[PDB]
Design a protein around this ligand. Sequence first.
Ligand SMILES: [Hg+2]
Lengths: 160, 366
Amino acid sequence: GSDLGRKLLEAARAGQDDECRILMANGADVNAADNTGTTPLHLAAYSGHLEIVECLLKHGADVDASDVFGYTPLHLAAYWGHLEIVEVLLKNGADVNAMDSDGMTPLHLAAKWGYLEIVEVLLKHGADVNAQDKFGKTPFDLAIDNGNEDIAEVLQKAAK
Amino acid sequence: LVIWINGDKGYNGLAEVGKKFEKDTGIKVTVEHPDKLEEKFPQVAATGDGPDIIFWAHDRFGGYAQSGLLAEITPDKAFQDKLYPFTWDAVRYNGKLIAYPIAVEALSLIYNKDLLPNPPKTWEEIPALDKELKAKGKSALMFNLQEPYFTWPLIAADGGYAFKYENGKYDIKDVGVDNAGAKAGLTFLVDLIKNKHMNADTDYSIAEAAFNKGETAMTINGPWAWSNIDTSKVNYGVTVLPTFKGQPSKPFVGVLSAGINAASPNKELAKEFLENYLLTDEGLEAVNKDKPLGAVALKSYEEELAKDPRIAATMENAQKGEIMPNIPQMSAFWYAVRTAVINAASGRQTVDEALKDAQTGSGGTP
Ligand SMILES: [Hg+2]
């Protein structure tokens, strides 16, 4: 995307829905990506701004774009506790079991940081509870290791 | 007595101690600060010339000693105890002491007391802290991620190390770059970047600019940076680095040391100037007045300097840090690890891949 692309990435990161609107109106590439594979939808899902995410998706943003670390927008949305964003990404065909370089999935991330309601919606869309990461840890194991009580129980019930 | 000390140190103050000696002994004392003296010394000392005493960071002296440029110093048992134990570990080559420790420097955690009155005691809680601050349009932590010197504190916390040290001797072959300790630390660092708590392109100027204008709650830096933060008028504090996996961060320690030239006929005479005229409360203050030494190796005077919490923090982190190997092979370490961290941070290589290369590149084995 060059000049406008870099600006779009910055607007997405900073959660500037207006700037994003203006940049896209000036021909900014919705699927622009920097050297690390980071796209506007990644930074938008990280910014926690819903309107921008919905805007990027409507312009043809790829929901399952992976960065160099194997992170999709869904990974960032879950990790940063943006429930509404997680729901929109999944609604737009996000891979719920997307796995990063270290075998981490959105469920692992949501389970790690106590995002109960995000764990629920993820499980609702078929999140794999028996998915082991590079350390052999399941999302349940992460819930236990981080003292997340209510989430460890839900993941247990789901497993059984 | 001819002495060489860098121009950025308080050489005028050291010269006052020189005036004292002369007036208290007779022998004249000249204090010079030639351009690029750390490179000039090994060339001029190889011809049997140079100064009687050389002041420079200890890390350089191991190369000097290896070429027999430095006379072995013989501090009595009583003198050893006047200085902090670990400082002597920085002036040994092949188990023998080749220099007197003068001052000590190490990285500390610098924080904005208005944005973060309660600085983190652990690395593990920074992600949560950054999440809270990002709501306010700010970040928890920004520091130079381009140089191993700045990222090693974390990488080494859980058992990483440059070269194995014991009995004043480094093992060129025992490198602790790709051990479980190093991989755990760098993985945590990369995860901070992967989750966007930090940016892989953050360098010295970017981190400095961000902290001094109140955009980030924390940074990592040394005493040299304080002066720029004072001018920014940010209400900052300097404190112990966060722990990782219950382990203290291990910053590299730089120890301004004074060596005696092997070609000097005034060995025992230089010993009296350093032990009884420079390494005292009076001697160190005379120098500190001209240009702050920061933390010092002399217990008595350090305890007075430590009334400044920033200096107290510097010493605390130094005591918990890793003395910078003073051996030439350290050039290989800097070179290899610098590439490994930048590559792991950018995803160009995985942690395991990056540190394996660094282990080999530093001269070690997997
Ligand atoms: Hg947009």
